[PDB]
Amino acid sequence: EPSDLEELEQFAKTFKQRRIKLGFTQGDVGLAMGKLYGNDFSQTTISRFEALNLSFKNMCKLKPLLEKWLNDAERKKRTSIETNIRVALEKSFLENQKPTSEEITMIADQLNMEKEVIRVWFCNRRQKEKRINP
């Protein structure tokens, strides 16, 4: 079973010191587990592991996978919306914060955008509102 707090911060410096020992940046350790698991984790994710910037679970699900790669040797790519579609969308939000799966289709198409990414854009956005202005 996954370790407790008193063991996680320990693995933290162990991984950092033992990492630059075999000469491998966190970014390289990322594409390293790529050719070891089916997919991978970015330089950011690995960074956050080092500085212990992750929840209990998110780090307990990683300690074992990280130690395999170090012990012995060996998800959809994020969509970045162009600022012109980020502003365009902000407007339709400003018209209606929750469009029907129909309107949503009629917007994605009306803008040449994968229907899904849009259904999601409004979701994260609505949640954003709730965080930003209550």
Binding site: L5, E9, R48, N53, L54, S55, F56, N58, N133
Partner: peptide, 22 residues
Amino acid sequence: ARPYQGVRVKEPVKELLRRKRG
């Protein structure tokens, strides 16, 4: 006054440590 548009990790082990110390 930037409100911090963007999401955060709740209870990162980093802060979880500095908490159970003082």
